[PDB]
Amino acid sequence: ELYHYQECVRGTTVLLKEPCSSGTYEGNSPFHPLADNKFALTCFSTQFAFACPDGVKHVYQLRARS
Q: To the nearest 10°, the Cα dihedral for 31, 33, 39, 40? A: -70
Could you give the CA distance from residue 66 to residue 51 in angstroms, rounded to a whole number?
31
Experiment used for this model: X-ray
| CATH dotted code for 1-66 | 2.60.40.1550
Cα-only R_g, the chain = 12
Q: CA-CA distance, 45 to 38, in Å (whole number)?
A: 20
47 and 61 Cβ atoms separated by less than 8 Å: yes
